[PDB]
C-alpha cells in the first residue's frame, strides 16, 4: 500500500521549555515561521507525497464527477428586503461564489447587484460581511482574499450599483452598522502591525478599536469612538437600535456567550459623532450574555442566559435598569434552548427553539410574550431567516440530512398568518426515498445520555459490515443540527456508508450546561462522548473499527486528533480539518487568545495539567499492543488559515511521522495536505470545496479498500 517515504524533518533538540516544572520539548518549533524557506520546503515535501496518494485511485475521479454533477443545480438563498428593494443570493450550481441579486418587487425582473466571481480568476476573493444603510440606498461589504479573516470594506450606491471611492483597511472581526441619518458607519479595525497582514502571518490580534467612517471621506479621517487600551483582548461590536437612537456596544473577551453591554444615546451627543462617545455602562461585567432584540423607547428587549442556561427574553428599562426591575418577557424552558429571536412588523417576535437538536419556529407578541403561531416544519434546521422591525413579512429556510432545502415566505399583514413555500429547487439529485434519519441517545462513560443522528439506507443488516463516517465538533456552544450535505450523501449512496453525527458536550444543544460540560477541566468529556459514540455504532452493528472514519474541523479537528491518540484501536480512518493541535501555544497566534475560555491557558499551572493530557501534539505515542497501530490519518489545512494557524497541523504531522510513522508496525499512512489561496473555510470557492472533499473520500475509499457503487 505505502510506496512512498516520509521526508527527513530536522529536529531542534534544544527547543525545551519549562511549564511549571514540567519540561516540554518542541523540536519542530521552527515550523511556526510560515515565511522561512525551511517551512516552505517542509510543506512542498509533504504535498509531494500526499497528492499522488490521493489522486492515484480512480475512485477520486468517480467521486469528483458525481459531486460535480450533483452540485450542478441552481441554489437560492433567502430573500430579504432593504429599503424599497428585494435581494437574494443565487448560484447556478458550480459558480465559485454565490451572487447577490436585486429586484424592485417580488414578482419583478432580477439583476446582478454584486458578483464576487469577477473579482478573481479562481474565485478566491469572497464576500465577508455586509450592511445596508438604514434606507437601503447604500451598501457596505467586506471582501476577503485567499480565505483570510482580514477584510477590506468597500461601498456601493444601490441605485445603478455604483462603486464609491470609500475603502476601509485593517478590518477583522468587525460588526458593520450605519447611523440612521445615513451619514456614516461604525466598524472595527486593528492598529498597524509589523510584517504582513494578508492571512499568512501568525501575529496576535490585540487592541481592536471601534471607528466611525463618514461616507465620502478618507479612512484616515475616521472617528475613534471606543478603545480599551488597558484590556487588549476586549472586542467591542456596535449595533444601532431599531429606532436609530442608541448605539449599543457588546464587548467580548473570549468566546464564552457573555458580553458587557454599553449604550450611547446619540441625541445626547453635543455635536454628533466627533470623538469617544458618552458610553453608559449598563452591564459592566462578563457574567451574562445580552443580545439585543428590539426596543420601544427606553424599554430594551434582550435574549439572555443570565441565570438561564437555556436562554430567555428579558426587558430592561434604561430609565430603571437595576436587575430586580427587569421583566421576564419569555421565561426559560426546562430543556429547549432559545437559539435566536428577531423582531418583525413592529410588535411580533420570531423565536427559534432547539428541541432535542431540531428547530421549531414560533411567533410571539412583543407586548406580552404570548405565543401566537407555530410555523410548521419537518425534522431539521432553520438556516436562513429575514425579517426586521419595519418589515411586514418573513422568509426562512429549512434544511435536513435528506432534504435539499425549502424557502418559506409569510405575509405578516394578514389576519391569519399562513406561511407558503416560496422556493424549492427540484433537481434529480440523490433519491432519499430509500434512506432514513434516526435519533438515538447513547450513554457516555459517566452515564450521561448523548444525542446522535444516524443516516442510513432502510433495512440494512446490522452486521458491522458498513463503512461509517462519524462527525463531531464539541465546543464553543455550537450546536450541530441537521444539514443537507451532497458530499456525505454520495458516501451513503455510492460508497454504501452510514453517516453519524454525535451531539457531544461542549456544544450548545442543551444550553450553557451542555457547553460547560465540555470545556476547561471537563474537556475530556468531549473525547469520552465521541469515543463512546464510536463504541455505540460498533456495538449496535452499524460498522466495525476498521470500517470507521472520524471527521472534525477546527475545534473538531482537535477532537478527532485526540481520539486517534487515545483510542487508535477504535478507528480505521481519521480526517482532521484545520485543527488546533498545539494546546500549549494556541493562545500566542492571531485570534487564538479568544479560545482560552473554552480550553484554558498554559500559563496557569492548573490549566497546563488539563491541557498536557490531551494536547494532540504532546500525546503522539506508539501503541503498546503488538497488534495496534495508528489509524490512517489525513490533516487538511491551508496557507492563509489565520483563524487556526497552519503551524498546528505542520508540527503535528512531523510529530506523527517521527514518533509513529518510523515504526515498522505502522503501515497506515499519516499525511497532510496544505492548500494554497485558502484559509479556515469560509468563502472557499466551489472548485476548491469539490477538490477537498474528493480528496477526503478518496482517502477513505483506499484506506478501507471500498468499491464505488454506481
Curated annotation (Swiss-Prot):
Catalytic activity annotation: Hydrolysis of Pro-|-Xaa >> Ala-|-Xaa in oligopeptides
Keywords assigned by UniProt, alphabetized: Acetylation, Cytoplasm, Hydrolase, Protease, Serine protease
Predominant subcellular localization, coarse grouping: cytoplasm
Protein name: Prolyl endopeptidase
N-acetylmethionine: modified positions: 1
Active site: 554, 641, 680
Location(s) in or outside the cell: Cytoplasm
Annotated tissue distribution: Ubiquitous.
GO biological process annotation, one example: proteolysis
PROSITE patterns recorded: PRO_ENDOPEP_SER
Role: Cleaves peptide bonds on the C-terminal side of prolyl residues within peptides that are up to approximately 30 amino acids long.
Native organism taxonomy: Eukaryota, Metazoa, Chordata, Craniata, Vertebrata
GO CC annotations on file: cytoplasm
Assigned protein family: Belongs to the peptidase S9A family.
Molecular-function annotations in GO: serine-type endopeptidase activity
SUPFAM superfamilies in UniProt: alpha/beta-Hydrolases, Peptidase/esterase 'gauge' domain
Domain of life: Eukaryota
Coiled coil spans: none
Modification sites for N6-acetyllysine: 157
Signal peptide extent: none
PANTHER family: PROLYL ENDOPEPTIDASE
Amino acid at each position: 500500500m505505502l510506496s512512498f517515504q516520509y521526508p527527513d524533518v530536522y529536529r531542534d533538540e534544544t527547543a525545551i521549555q519549562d511549564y511549571h516544572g514540567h519540561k516540554v520539548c518542541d523540536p519542530y518549533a521552527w515550523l511556526e515561521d510560515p515565511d522561512s524557506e525551511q517551512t516552505k520546503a517542509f510543506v512542498e515535501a509533504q504535498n509531494k507525497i500526499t497528492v499522488p496518494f490521493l489522486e492515484q485511485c480512480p475512485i477520486r475521479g468517480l467521486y469528483k464527477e458525481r459531486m460535480t454533477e450533483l452540485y450542478d443545480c441552481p441554489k437560492y438563498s433567502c430573500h430579504f428586503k432593504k429599503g424599497k428593494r428585494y435581494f437574494y443570493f443565487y448560484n447556478t450550481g458550480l459558480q465559485n461564489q454565490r451572487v447577490l441579486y436585486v429586484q424592485d418587487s417580488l414578482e419583478g425582473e432580477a439583476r446582478v447587484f454584486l458578483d464576487p466571481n469577477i473579482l478573481s480568476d479562481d474565485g478566491t476573493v469572497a464576500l465577508r460581511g455586509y450592511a445596508f444603510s438604514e434606507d437601503g440606498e447604500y451598501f457596505a461589504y467586506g471582501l476577503s482574499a485567499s480565505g483570510s479573516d482580514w477584510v477590506t470594506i468597500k461601498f456601493m450606491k444601490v441605485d445603478g450599483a455604483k462603486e464609491l471611492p470609500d475603502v476601509l483597511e485593517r478590518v477583522k472581526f468587525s460588526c458593520m452598522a450605519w447611523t440612521h441619518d445615513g451619514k456614516g458607519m461604525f466598524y472595527n479595525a486593528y492598529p498597524q502591525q509589523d510584517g504582513k497582514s494578508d492571512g499568512t502571518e501568525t501575529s496576535t490580534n490585540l487592541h481592536q478599536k471601534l471607528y466611525y467612517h463618514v461616507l465620502g471621506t478618507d479612512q484616515s479621517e475616521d472617528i475613534l469612538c471606543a478603545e480599551f487600551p488597558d484590556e487588549p483582548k476586549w472586542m467591542g461590536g456596535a449595533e444601532l437600535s431599531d429606532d436609530g437612537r442608541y448605539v449599543l456596544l457588546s464587548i467580548r473577551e473570549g468566546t464564552d456567550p457573555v458580553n458587557r453591554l454599553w449604550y450611547c444615546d446619540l441625541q445626547q451627543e453635543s455635536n454628533g459623532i466627533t470623538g469617544i462617545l458618552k458610553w453608559v455602562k449598563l452591564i459592566d461585567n462578563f457574567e451574562g450574555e445580552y443580545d439585543y432584540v428590539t426596543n420601544e423607547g427606553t424599554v430594551f428587549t434582550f435574549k439572555t442566559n443570565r441565570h438561564s442556561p437555556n436562554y430567555r427574553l428579558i426587558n430592561i428599562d434604561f430609565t430603571d435598569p437595576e436587575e430586580s426591575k427587569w421583566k421576564v418577557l419569555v421565561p426559560e424552558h426546562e430543556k429547549d434552548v432559545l437559539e435566536w429571536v428577531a423582531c418583525v412588523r413592529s410588535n411580533f417576535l420570531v423565536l427559534c427553539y432547539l428541541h432535542d437538536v431540531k428547530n421549531t419556529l414560533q411567533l410571539h407578541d412583543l407586548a406580552t410574550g404570548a405565543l401566537l403561531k407555530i410555523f410548521p416544519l419537518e425534522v431539521g434546521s432553520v438556516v436562513g431567516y429575514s425579517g426586521q422591525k419595519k418589515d411586514t413579512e418573513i422568509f426562512y429556510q429549512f434544511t435536513s440530512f435528506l432534504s435539499p432545502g425549502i424557502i418559506y415566505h409569510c405575509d405578516l399583514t394578514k389576519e391569519e398568518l399562513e406561511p407558503r413555500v416560496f422556493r424549492e429547487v427540484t433537481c434529480k439529485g440523490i433519491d432519499a426515498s430509500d434512506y432514513q434519519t434516526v435519533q438515538i441517545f447513547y450513554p457516555s462513560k459517566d452515564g450521561t445520555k448523548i444525542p446522535m443522528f444516524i443516516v442510513h439506507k432502510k433495512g440494512i443488516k446490522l452486521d458491522g459490515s458498513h463503512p461509517a463516517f462519524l462527525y463531531g465538533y464539541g465546543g464553543f456552544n455550537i450546536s450541530i443540527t441537521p444539514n443537507y450535505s451532497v458530499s456525505r450523501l454520495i458516501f451513503v449512496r455510492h460508497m454504501g456508508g452510514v453517516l453519524a453525527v454525535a451531539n457531544i458536550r461542549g456544544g450548545g444543544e442543551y444550553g450553557e450546561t451542555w457547553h460547560k460540560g465540555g470545556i476547561l477541566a471537563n474537556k475530556q468529556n468531549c473525547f469520552d462522548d465521541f469515543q463512546c459514540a464510536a463504541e455505540y455504532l460498533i456495538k449496535e452493528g452499524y460498522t466495525s473499527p476498521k470500517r470507521l472514519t472520524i471527521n472534525g474541523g477546527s475545534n473538531g479537528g482537535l477532537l478527532v486528533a485526540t481520539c486517534a491518540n487515545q483510542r487508535p484501536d477504535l478507528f480505521g480512518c481519521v480526517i482532521a480539518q484545520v485543527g488546533v493541535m498545539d494546546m500549549l501555544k494556541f493562545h500566542k497566534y492571531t485570534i487564538g487568545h479568544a479560545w482560552t475560555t473554552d480550553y484554558g491557558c498554559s500559563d496557569s499551572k492548573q490549566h497546563f495539567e488539563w491541557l498536557i493530557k490531551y494536547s494532540p501534539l504532546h500525546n503522539v505515542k506508539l501503541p503498546e499492543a503488538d497488534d495496534i497501530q495508528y489509524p490512517s490519518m489525513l490533516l487538511l489545512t491551508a496557507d492563509h488559515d489565520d483563524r487556526v494557524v497552519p503551524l498546528h497541523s505542520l508540527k503535528f504531522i512531523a510529530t506523527l511521522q517521527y514518533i509513529v510513522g518510523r515504526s515498522r508496525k505502522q503501515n497506515n499512512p499519516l499525511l497532510i495536505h496544505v492548500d494554497t489561496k485558502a484559509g479556515h473555510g469560509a468563502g472557499k470557492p466551489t472548485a476548491k470545496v469539490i477538490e477537498e472533499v474528493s480528496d477526503m473520500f478518496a482517502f477513505i475509499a483506499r484506506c478501507l479498500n471500498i468499491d464505488w457503487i454506481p
